[PDB]
Write a protein that binds this ligand. Structure first.
Ligand SMILES: Cc1cc2nc3c(=O)[nH]c(=O)nc-3n(C[C@H](O)[C@H](O)[C@H](O)COP(=O)(O)OP(=O)(O)OC[C@H]3O[C@@H](n4cnc5c(N)ncnc54)[C@H](O)[C@@H]3O)c2cc1C
Length: 369
């Protein structure tokens, strides 16, 4: 029986833990925080993430209580400029807690040993993980799924470029208020852009009958539109049709203006250590693939560990096989974010949807456009 030690209890670490435990690994997972929780309010998944959830035995619990809008709509200056449905490609909006709780419930059902208040502070490619307590754990595989600030990565030393933006956005869950919104297509995703009379955008993202995910985006140089708790007037002025939801948003004193952040590395492996998720490839969120690529890569790691090879060799084959999809998606996401490409509408082209089209279970691209 092969042993894996996983650092990080986010989507990458929980996916790796479940996938490895289903293949007969003895897996233990270490989360630094004192509780198992996910920040960020809401999240989109696409076919590729949903197929990972199927492969993990967690798809049902995610689809119950989450939403596929009838269309992904874009507005520019309150005019609908596109409505896209991706020729049937599956996608889904949910709260972060919904996704994260479905994964924890599945890891617990399978008997993955999960520890909280358990931080990985150093790792050794020969298969050792040191916790903040000074416990040294030996394993046949070490998974660094410890986020953009991964200590598994930085204790070993990987050549990298890391960037944190000055700009960011405010992501919140509020009640749907659907009756109070009155006439409209309030089950849709609506990406509501404006450059005039100021730069303000809301991505409107229903999660289910009760819960609405809003992303309120304004530049950090705008002291009102970047304020938390939200400056209700500046948001109601440019999105008056969402006033019932904005009034609920303005009650949230836990709101944060979170910044964008990216990582790109020379490599994702060293000996028996694999870096998965934002530890390796954090990206701009324009294509809503950061967690999709983290989950595809974590599940794909598990697949390459079933080939009969040494763990070291399986890790090299895994990066070689799967990294190009993530490098392309990171680059394209970044290009769309810098160019504000989504503001044009009709930008979920075949190329943009390549990562979402990938099926990690069959290892082919599906849902042709
Ligand atoms: C504004 C924004 C919008 C986004 N929207 C989407 C979207 O709609 N769809 C999508 O797919 N992606 C989205 N993403 C990307 C997604 O949030 C991340 O890519 C994904 O959460 C990364 O998962 P992860 O498990 O690698 O890291 P994380 O989710 O960061 O989890 C790492 C976990 O490790 C713990 N940890 C950290 N260090 C240690 C350590 N040393 N030891 C032990 N535990 C540790 C942390 O506490 C945390 O629980 C978005 C990101 C941003 C910034």
């Amino acid at each position: 029986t092969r042993r894996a030690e996983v650092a990080g209890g986010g989507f990458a670490g929980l996916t790796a833990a479940i996938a490895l435990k289903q293949n007969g690994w003895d897996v233990r997972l270490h989360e630094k925080s004192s509780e198992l929780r996910a920040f960020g309010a809401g999240i989109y998944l696409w076919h590729n993430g949903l197929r990972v959830l199927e492969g993990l035995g967690a798809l049902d619990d995610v689809l119950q209580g989450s939403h596929t809008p009838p269309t992904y709509e874009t507005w520019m200056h309150n005019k609908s400029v596109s409505k896209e449905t991706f020729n049937g490609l599956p996608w889904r909006i949910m709260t972060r807690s919904h996704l994260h709780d479905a994964l924890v419930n599945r890891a617990r059902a399978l008997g993955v040993d999960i520890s909280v208040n358990s931080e990985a502070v150093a790792a050794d490619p020969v298969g050792r993980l040191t916790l903040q307590t000074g416990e040294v754990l030996e394993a046949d595989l070490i998974v660094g799924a410890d986020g953009v600030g991964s200590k598994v990565r930085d204790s070993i030393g990987f050549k990298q470029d890391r960037w944190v933006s000055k700009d960011g956005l405010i992501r919140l869950i509020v009640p749907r208020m659907k009756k109070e919104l009155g006439h409209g297509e309030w089950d849709n995703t609506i990406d509501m852009w404006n450059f005039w009379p100021r730069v303000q955008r809301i991505l409107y993202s229903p999660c289910n009958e009760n819960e609405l995910y809003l992303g309120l985006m304004a530049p950090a140089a705008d002291p009102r539109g970047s304020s938390v708790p939200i400056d209700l007037e500046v948001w109601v002025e440019m999105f008056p049709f969402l006033e019932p939801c904005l009034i609920e948003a303005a009650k949230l004193k836990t709101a944060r203006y979170d910044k964008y952040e990216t990582t790109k590395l020379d490599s994702w492996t060293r000996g028996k250590v694999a870096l998965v998720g934002d530890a390796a490839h954090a990206m701009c969120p324009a294509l809503a693939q950061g967690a999709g690529c983290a989950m595809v890569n974590a599940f794909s790691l598990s697949q390459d560990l079933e080939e009969g090879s040494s763990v070291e060799d399986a890790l090299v084959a895994w990066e070689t096989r799967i990294r190009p999809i993530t490098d392309r998606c990171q680059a394209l996401s970044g290009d769309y974010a810098a160019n504000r490409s989504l503001s044009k509408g009709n930008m979920f082209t075949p190329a943009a949807l390549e990562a979402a089209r990938y099926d990690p279970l069959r290892r082919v691209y599906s849902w042709p456009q």
